[PDB]
Paper text:
Toll-like Receptor 3 (TLR3) plays a key role in anti-viral defenses by inducing a potent immune response against double-stranded RNAs (dsRNAs) produced by viral infection. The charge interaction with the phosphate backbone of the RNA double helix plays the principal role in the interaction. The ligand-binding site involves both the N and C-terminal parts of the TLR3 ectodomain.
To determine whether the transmembrane and intracellular domains are necessary for the linear clustering of TLR3, we produced the ectodomain of TLR3 (ectoTLR3) and determined its structure in complex with poly(I:C) dsRNA. The electron micrographs show that the majority of the ectoTLR3s are in the clustered state. The structure of the ectoTLR3-dsRNA complex is not changed by the deletion mutation and is superimposable with that of the full-length TLR3-dsRNA complex with an r.m.s.d. of 0.42 Å. Interestingly, the C-terminal ends of the TLR3 ectodomains in the cluster point to the same direction even without the transmembrane and intracellular domains. First, as shown in Fig. 2, the deletion of both the transmembrane and the intracellular domains did not change the structure of the receptor cluster. Close inspection of the region between the TLR3 dimeric units in the cluster shows that the charge interaction plays a role in the clustering. The closest contact area between the dimeric TLR3 units is composed of the negatively charged N-terminal and the positively charged C-terminal residues of the neighboring ectoTLR3 dimers. The distance between these charged areas is more than 6 angstroms and appears too far to be considered a strong interaction.
Numbering used by the authors: 484 to 687
Write the structure that this text describes.
Amino acid sequence: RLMLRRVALKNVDSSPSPFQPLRNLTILDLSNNNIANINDDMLEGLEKLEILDLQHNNLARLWKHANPGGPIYFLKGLSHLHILNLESNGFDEIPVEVFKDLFELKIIDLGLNNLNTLPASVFNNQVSLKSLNLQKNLITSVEKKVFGPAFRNLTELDMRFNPFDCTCESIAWFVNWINETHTNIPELSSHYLCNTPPHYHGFP
RNA sequence: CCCCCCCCCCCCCCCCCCCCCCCCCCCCCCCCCCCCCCCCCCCCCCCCCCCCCCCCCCCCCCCCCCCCCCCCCCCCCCCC
């Protein structure tokens, strides 16, 4: 376990990964450090890593398609990763094959970001997901082609402050899944308020 | 056994002049190549300064909400 929360890491983007000798590393916290550039091969050889926290950082550019050199898939080879946190990273786009190898992911956190559109068929490999947290984002539509495999068998859901769109093309499957479910959705009728169109403005 | 004087023709040598043909050097013009310097055309790379745009982090301010601690008051009831 190596905790580096709010330590302002510098020279973190070296060509050889400093966590390469850490073969038995299981918990790694890199939160509140304003890390900007992260290499692709930083977590190579980290088969036994389970807990990864990268919340409150600046990795928005690393996932956009306009980033030179291509998006950074720094989550490859993490077969045993269990809890992942990416809060307040300012993410605006998620690459399609970033979560391709997380076969044992159960807890994922993506709140307080600028997510608006997610690629279709991204959460196929998370067959053992438990909690999905997307509070305080800019998402507007929830559909099967992206959130179908995500909502297979969960236990928690955190999507409070989002401007949901009330349209049969964008929310009908979502509200249908709300009607019958066993996942714990707290304050479902308090902050899951429809922002757009103004006809359904504020309607749960 | 004799010298002299005239003339024709053909020689040889030497000085001058005029012809071709060639060599060397030089002059003028032009062309080609090499080197040096300079000007212009663009397309740029690197560095610095200035100005903005996005995202994020620390600190601070304002408005709150919850919890904890302390103080006061109102009503009800007992002890001596």
